[PDB]
Amino acid sequence: PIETVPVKLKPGMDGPKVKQWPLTEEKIKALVEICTEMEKEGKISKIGPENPYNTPVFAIKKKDSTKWRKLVDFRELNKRTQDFWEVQLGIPHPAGLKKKKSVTVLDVGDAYFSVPLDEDFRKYTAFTIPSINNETPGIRYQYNVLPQGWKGSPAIFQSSMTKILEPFRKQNPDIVIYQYMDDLYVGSDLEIGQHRTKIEELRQHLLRWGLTTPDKKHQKEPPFLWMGYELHPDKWTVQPIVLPEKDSWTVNDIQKLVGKLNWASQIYPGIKVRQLCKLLRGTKALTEVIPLTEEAELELAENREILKEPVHGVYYDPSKDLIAEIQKQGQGQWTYQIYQEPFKNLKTGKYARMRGAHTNDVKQLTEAVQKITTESIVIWGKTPKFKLPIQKETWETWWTEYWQATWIPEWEFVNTPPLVKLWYQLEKEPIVGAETFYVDAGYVTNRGRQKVVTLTDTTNQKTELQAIYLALQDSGLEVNIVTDSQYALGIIQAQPDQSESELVNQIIEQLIKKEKVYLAWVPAH
């Protein structure tokens, strides 16, 4: 038997005392039968009038079958049960798995009832099966094992299974076992016969504790279509994605398409969705039809072709280095691929996360490095050596001059156009011979010139970007610009090369054409 896990109710609460719904004789007859079965099996045992707690039960028929099932409504008891460590949503990613000669999945089979329930807690699982004639039986029961559908069941069952498997695991340190729901995955590099035997051995080890497992004649064989994936002994991939051939596309359709499209990203490089996302602008209803533009059409056609190609990922080989390579697919878009062996990945991906309203490729590429770093540590436990399209000098220039602290692991420059660069750099010292503009929506120069323009609907801070812009447009190749807007100063000082604000983008364009620019700040009153 297994060691009982002590359960407690949430502090300051009493057990469930909820009424049982009136039942149909037909069903009562079914319940009495099922409950007796469970009592003979010791799963449950009748109680005395001592117990005031109760939980509703009802009979259900099996889907597309003709027979009775017993369902207990543990909602209430669950609200009152303490929290457990429970199952974290942390699941293994296919690219983290290694190659195996043979893998099998043993379907545990309701081991919930195979595991005992803390005696002290047992009373809280009380339920009642009403009598057929008014004043009569009305059998009262309580659980002796883990109730199907109870709060602690999934957690306690998993903990129990782990203990039960500790030994078998120490005995065979060449066999990986992974638990998931009512499934037990066993993988191994044993030649087929040896494996097949070891599996039968594991089954017996479960049977000793009551975990009735399935025979090799009805077990699930690879691939393992698990969570949108298709698991194989040596390779992996995602469940085949089929793109619709619609004439009319609803916003809902377009939205689902982008979702399926994004999913593919992790393995299919080249998947693009920008054009498709644009169809969502100004949409008034999920049922609204948006015709497709020539660019969206071209993008859909391209992804369709990309998907007609059954690419697959490869498992991790602990003996070889991890290599991450990053590229610029578009403005703001970066594509990466992690491989151990020359140009054939374990996983791929995209990075479009724009942090802040303005940025530059150098800053953005850096942030992609950090995402991959976190992701690699999570999946493979170590960071990959990166191959980036930026030269050392370029990175060091930006780095040492930026106010924030940054650090890139270990990388190598890869001359693969486009090479990321800084399109412009502000002067560290005011330009001699250059004209000086004193902005405020209007500027005045040392040379006498001046323009006062009219701005409508402008925000306080945007008016400040405008003046700078103005000075920028009317000046020569070399300019000195004095401003009082610490805001505008901040932005332009950041050396952005892309922004959400078109005004900033224009200023940026102006900045690129100049030979020399010095921006200075001063309080103005």
Q: Which residues are annotated as a binding site for Mg(2+)?
A: 107, 182-183, 440, 464, 484
**Complex with ligand TB9: residue 180 or 487, whichever CB lies closer:** 180
**Complex with ligand TB9: residue 233 or 384, whichever CB lies closer:** 233
518 is an interface residue for another protein by CB under 8 A: yes
Residues in contact with another protein, shown as a per-residue x/- string from 332 to 351 under the rule CB under 8 A: --------------------
Contact in structure between 273 and 299 (CB atoms under 8 Å): yes
- CA–CA distance, 472 with 481 (Å, rounded to integer): 8
Structure tokens, 521: 């700040």
171 is an interface residue for another protein by CB under 8 A: no
Cα-flanking dihedrals φ and ψ of residue 293, to 5°? -85, 160
103 is an interface residue for ligand TB9 by CB under 6 A: yes
Residue with tokens 């922004």: 499
250 is an interface residue for another protein by CB under 8 A: no
Work out what residue 524 binds among ligand TB9, another protein, Mg ion, none; the CB cut-off runs from 5 to 8 Å by kind: Mg ion
**Complex with ligand TB9: residue 180 or 411, whichever CB lies closer:** 180
Residue with tokens 């057929």: 132
**Complex with ligand TB9: residue 221 or 309, whichever CB lies closer:** 221
Rg (CA), the chain: 33
Structure tokens, 249: 């596309």
Contact in structure between 345 and 314 (CB atoms under 8 Å): yes
Span near another protein by CB under 8 A; candidates 34-42, 133-141, 364-372, 467-475: 364-372
92 is an interface residue for ligand TB9 by CB under 6 A: yes
443 is an interface residue for Mg ion by CB under 5 A: no
Q: Which residue among 383, 458, 501, 505 contacts another protein (CB under 8 A)?
A: 383
What is residue 133's three-state secondary structure?
coil
- CA–CA distance, 83 with 449 (Å, rounded to integer): 73
Residues in contact with ligand TB9, shown as a per-residue x/- string from 149 to 178 under the rule CB under 6 A: ---------------------------x-x
CB of 522 to another protein, least distance (A): 5
374 is an interface residue for another protein by CB under 8 A: yes
Contact in structure between 233 and 103 (CB atoms under 8 Å): yes
Contact in structure between 414 and 420 (CB atoms under 8 Å): no
**Complex with ligand TB9: residue 227 or 522, whichever CB lies closer:** 227
β-sheet bridge partners, residue 140:
128
Residues 220-249 touching ligand TB9, rule: CB under 6 A, are 222, 224, 226, 231-233
Q: Which residue among 54, 55, 74, 93 contacts another protein (CB under 8 A)?
A: 93
- Cβ burial, residue 103 (10 Å; 0-12/13-18/19+): buried
518 is an interface residue for ligand TB9 by CB under 6 A: no
- CA–CA distance, 325 with 346 (Å, rounded to integer): 12
Angle among Cα 199, 205, 208 to the nearest 5 degrees reads 145
* Selection from 375, 259, 277 nearest residue 326 by Cα: 375
**Complex with Mg ion: residue 141 or 438, whichever CB lies closer:** 438
- CA–CA distance, 442 with 452 (Å, rounded to integer): 4
180 is an interface residue for ligand TB9 by CB under 6 A: yes
82 is an interface residue for another protein by CB under 8 A: yes
Q: Most distant CA pair in the chain: distance in Å?
A: 108
CB of 20 to another protein, least distance (A): 29
- Cβ burial, residue 124 (10 Å; 0-12/13-18/19+): buried
400 is an interface residue for another protein by CB under 8 A: yes
Residues 399-438 touching Mg ion, rule: CB under 5 A, are 438
Cα-flanking dihedrals φ and ψ of residue 45, to 5°? -150, 135
**Complex with another protein: residue 142 or 495, whichever CB lies closer:** 495
190 is an interface residue for ligand TB9 by CB under 6 A: no
Residue with tokens 């619609």: 246
Q: Would you tell me how many other CB atoms lie within 10 Å of the CB of residue 59? A: 17
- CA–CA distance, 256 with 263 (Å, rounded to integer): 11
346 is an interface residue for ligand TB9 by CB under 6 A: no
524 is an interface residue for Mg ion by CB under 5 A: yes
Contact in structure between 331 and 288 (CB atoms under 8 Å): no
- CA–CA distance, 408 with 203 (Å, rounded to integer): 49
CB of 390 to another protein, least distance (A): 16
> What angle do helix axes 486-493 and 460-474 make, rounded to 10 degrees?
60
- CA–CA distance, 336 with 343 (Å, rounded to integer): 12
CB of 352 to another protein, least distance (A): 16
84 is an interface residue for ligand TB9 by CB under 6 A: no
- CA–CA distance, 225 with 348 (Å, rounded to integer): 20
**Complex with another protein: residue 46 or 382, whichever CB lies closer:** 382
CB of 115 to ligand TB9, least distance (A): 22
- CA–CA distance, 69 with 365 (Å, rounded to integer): 57
Q: Which residue among 61, 344, 382, 392 contacts another protein (CB under 8 A)?
A: 382
483 is an interface residue for another protein by CB under 8 A: no
Specify the amino acid at residue 242: V
172 is an interface residue for another protein by CB under 8 A: no
Structure tokens, 129: 């099966």
**Complex with ligand TB9: residue 14 or 317, whichever CB lies closer:** 317
Residues near Mg ion (CB under 5 A) are 438, 440, 524
Residues near ligand TB9 (CB under 6 A) are 92, 97-98, 100, 103, 176, 178, 180, 185, 187, 222, 224, 226, 231-233
Residues near another protein (CB under 8 A) are 5-8, 82-86, 88, 90-93, 96-97, 152, 155-156, 158-159, 162, 176, 178-179, 367, 370-371, 373-374, 377-383, 399-407, 430-436, 438, 444-446, 480, 482, 486, 489-490, 493, 518, 520-523
